[PDB]
Design an enzyme around this catalytic site. Sequence first.
Site, PDB file in Angstrom:
ATOM      1  N   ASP A 200      27.148 -77.283 101.522  1.00 47.32           N
ATOM      2  CA  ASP A 200      27.579 -77.131 100.136  1.00 47.32           C
ATOM      3  C   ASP A 200      29.069 -77.455  99.984  1.00 47.32           C
ATOM      4  O   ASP A 200      29.839 -76.678  99.399  1.00 47.32           O
ATOM      5  CB  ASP A 200      27.268 -75.732  99.595  1.00 47.32           C
ATOM      6  CG  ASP A 200      27.286 -75.678  98.035  1.00 47.32           C
ATOM      7  OD1 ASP A 200      26.996 -76.709  97.367  1.00 47.32           O
ATOM      8  OD2 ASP A 200      27.570 -74.594  97.471  1.00 47.32           O
TER       9      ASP A 200
ATOM     10  N   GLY B 243      35.192 -62.816  91.004  1.00 43.73           N
ATOM     11  CA  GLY B 243      34.140 -63.806  91.018  1.00 43.73           C
ATOM     12  C   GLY B 243      32.757 -63.216  91.044  1.00 43.73           C
ATOM     13  O   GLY B 243      32.575 -62.048  91.358  1.00 43.73           O
TER      14      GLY B 243
ATOM     15  N   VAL C  77      29.068 -59.882  93.953  1.00 44.18           N
ATOM     16  CA  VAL C  77      30.415 -59.889  93.416  1.00 44.18           C
ATOM     17  C   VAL C  77      31.465 -60.116  94.496  1.00 44.18           C
ATOM     18  O   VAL C  77      31.248 -59.802  95.667  1.00 44.18           O
ATOM     19  CB  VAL C  77      30.687 -58.538  92.716  1.00 44.18           C
ATOM     20  CG1 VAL C  77      32.032 -58.543  91.995  1.00 44.18           C
ATOM     21  CG2 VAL C  77      29.566 -58.249  91.757  1.00 44.18           C
TER      22      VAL C  77
END
EC number: 2.7.11.26
Lengths: 339, 339
Positions: free
Chosen positions: B143, B29, B35
Amino acid sequence: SKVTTVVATPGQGPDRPQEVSYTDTKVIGNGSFGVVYQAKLCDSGELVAIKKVLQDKRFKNRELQIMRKLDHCNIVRLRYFFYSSVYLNLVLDYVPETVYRVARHYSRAKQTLPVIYVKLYMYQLFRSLAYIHSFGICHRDIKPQNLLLDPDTAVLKLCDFGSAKQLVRGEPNVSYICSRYYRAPELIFGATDYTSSIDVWSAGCVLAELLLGQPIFPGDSGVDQLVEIIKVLGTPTREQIREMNPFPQIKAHPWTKVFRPRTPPEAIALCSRLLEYTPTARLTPLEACAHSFFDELRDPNVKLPNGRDTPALFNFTTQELSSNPPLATILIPPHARIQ
Amino acid sequence: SKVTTVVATPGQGPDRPQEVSYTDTKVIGNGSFGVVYQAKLCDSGELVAIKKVLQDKRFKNRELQIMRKLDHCNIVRLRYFFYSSDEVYLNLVLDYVPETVYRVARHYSRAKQTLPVIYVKLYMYQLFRSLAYIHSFGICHRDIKPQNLLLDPDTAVLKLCDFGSAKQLVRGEPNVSYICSRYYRAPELIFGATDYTSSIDVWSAGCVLAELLLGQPIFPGDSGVDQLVEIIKVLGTPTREQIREMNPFPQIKAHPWTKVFRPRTPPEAIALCSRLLEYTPTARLTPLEACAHSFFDELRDPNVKLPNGRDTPALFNFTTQELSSNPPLATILIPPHAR
């Protein structure tokens, strides 16, 4: 076949009712507020778009009142409007393509749009912005899907004034307008005293996107969008923050390293003058049109790739030039001053 | 094979670094800030995810500080953290979890299939447990969305992840309003409030539930304006009092929550939705109250099993910390048979 005859009022002009006949009605859009149909005018055979929306008499329709003041070669025109079932019906110019769709075709084919088209499209968008801003009107939703195109003539027309509004200094305005990827920083930060320069930031995002092949400031949340902006523009100073108003420290990233190898230097320069943190530091639409990135459009020999002549580009009106008359010395080239 | 060894600090344990070796490294990802890698711990053979982000230095990493205080079965746990490199990088060694609510929901969606409600129950319940836990420390995730709800297919265990936007909310203190992703943002955030509470996480959770029942996002839109039109179509126009409670006028009327979802939709599922998606922040259920809702009664049945035949994962091992917002709820949350 079916025919619908109505008595409408002309978009702009004297209030003199007219009989309009159209056939071939079909839905082509369902934009939140209502329905958009494509229709064919019975006598000229010409196509038009009709936006149908429910209208409450508690107030007059803000979009309608704005569209009755506008008439420009780079804006979808209100031809007539009429009431039915109470529904307001706006009869508009019909344009078959969009910048979004064209850019997408090149995008998934791993190609970029030829720069002559980037020039033609961006130039016409800035002309339409200079015109509406001259009346103090801010579009507030500049994005590729609202830039209609006619493929053969390369004429571009701005559309959808459902979020448009006249901005009066000292008055507050909602900060939740404008679409993801194209919102100016001051809007992401929640400012309510922003100016028409938010439309310029949006236009800068569209230009960057046509050069890059993809959106320049992507992100599903404001936070992610800002990280992308800072990676390019660098961290904003506290002074720049105050100018936008309502803190990972990254240093400025060379704009040339942002775009591909053979990107025209002038294209990159224009971008950097549009995408500025300080709202007042961004070029105005008229100043953008006069930028050297557009010099080739002013060349008397320029032609479209399909061989045809470029569309109207220099027929400026006093209204259109009012923000800065001297610019006409640049905007209207010599071969346009001959006869 | 390239085996790597580092001296890492235990996530919640005492500050006593130990040598840790891992192998089989690969990128899985690109988490904005850096990263994320997958890797296998040499000693145990366990898979872990390693998040690597550049570190400020003269500043404490907020995500690290919040993660050092959390240890819940429904939250991705920080196992170790270490620094490496001419700048410095912070590496978070986290539990590895193969799937996501986002991916699983999309599978059913494009197969025109409904996610069996037994899974809607299991997933939503575990999300509310993780929210009750972090909110008990005053921490708001900010989020909540399907891509941050990781899943282990066989066990049906769900774990909340990505605390990069998380923050302890202190009354009287202002917080940015540009957090949270599109489709899941509470109205008060769309209106730009800076004094919001943890109940924004509850609104987000309600959007995830609605989405699993519907097969698609309940409040889509590329701009705040469009998102609000969608919200009003369902909740109806907000009163001036409800607006005041969100922050400092389409005129639509409420649509039956019952008519929002397909016919065979469990009544309790619809009732929970309406208690989560309320304009007034203070009127929304708390995470703990949500867990106790009758929509989740089947999970408390001693005979309930997963479709694959296995037992349900841990659901009743509540701690005092977790129950602190409302101890009496334990009479409901921990069923008679629950050990």
